Amino acid sequence: MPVLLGIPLLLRFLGFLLVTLFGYLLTFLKKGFGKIAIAISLFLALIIGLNSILVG
Amino acid sequence: FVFGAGKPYEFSIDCDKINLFRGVFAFLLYVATFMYVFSTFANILRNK
């Protein structure tokens, strides 16, 4: 299906930006699931900590 | 403690029956602290 000389490269580029940008969203998602790991850890560590004082 | 130093009516509250009270009194203060430390750990997330 005949096309001009530059259209096939505009169509390949408009799906490079999309995969790059959808690649960044993934990186940031994974980071925010690491915050909920730090948070949980902290809480349970403060509980185990108080126990050791009171029983002493 | 001596009531009536020198007079015919001299008597003394002795220590043998007071030392027994201090024994029961110690116990009833430990029981009342164990039941406070305990119950404050259990309700640490129950906003008192």
Swiss-Prot record, chain A:
Keyword Zinc: no
Residues spanning the membrane: 3-23, 36-56
Protein origin, superkingdom: Viruses
GO CC term, one of those recorded: membrane
Compartment(s) of residence: Virion; Host membrane
Keywords per UniProt: Host membrane, Membrane, Transmembrane, Transmembrane helix, Viral penetration into host cytoplasm, Viral penetration into host cytoplasm via pilus retraction, Virion, Virus entry into host cell
Entry's Gene Ontology BP terms: symbiont entry into host cell
Keyword Acetylation: no
Record membrane topology: Multi-pass membrane protein
General function of this protein: Plays essential roles both in the entry of the viral genome into the bacterial host and in budding process. The formation of the G3P-G6P complex termed adsorption complex is essential for correct termination of filamentous phage assembly.
Subunit record text: Interacts with G3P; this interaction is required for proper integration of G3P and G6P into the virion.
Family affiliation: Belongs to the inovirus G6P protein family.
Annotated protein name in UniProt: Head virion protein G6P
Organism expressing this protein natively: Enterobacteria phage f1 (Bacteriophage f1)
Lineage, highest ranks first: Viruses, Monodnaviria, Loebvirae, Hofneiviricota, Faserviricetes
Gene: VI
Covered range of the whole protein: 1 to 56 of 112
Swiss-Prot record, chain B:
Compartment list: Virion; Host membrane
Membrane-spanning intervals of the chain: 24-44
Highest taxon in the source lineage: Viruses
Subunit structure: Interacts with G6P; this interaction is required for proper integration of G3P and G6P into the virion. Interacts with G8P. Interacts with the tip of the host pilus. Interacts (via N-terminus) with host TolA. Interacts (via transmembrane domain) with host TolQ (via 2nd and 3rd transmembrane domains); this interaction allows the phage translocation across the host inner membrane. Interacts (via transmembrane domain) with host TolR (via transmembrane domain); this interaction allows the phage translocation across the host inner membrane.
Domain notes: Consists of 3 domains (N1/D1, N2/D2, and CT) separated by glycine-rich repeats and a C-terminal transmembrane segment. The N2 domain interacts with the F pilus, whereas the N1 domain forms a complex with the C-terminal domain of TolA at later stages of the infection process. The C-terminal domain is required for release of viral particles from the host bacterial membrane and proper integration of G3P and G6P proteins in the virion.
Family from the record: Belongs to the inovirus G3P protein family.
Function: Plays essential roles both in the penetration of the viral genome into the bacterial host via pilus retraction and in the extrusion process. During the initial step of infection, G3P mediates adsorption of the phage to its primary receptor, the tip of host F-pilus. Attachment of the phage causes pilus retraction bringing the viral particle into close proximity of the host cell inner membrane.
Name listed for the protein in its UniProt record: Attachment protein G3P
Organism this protein belongs to: Enterobacteria phage f1
Parent-protein start and end of this portion: 375 to 422 of 424
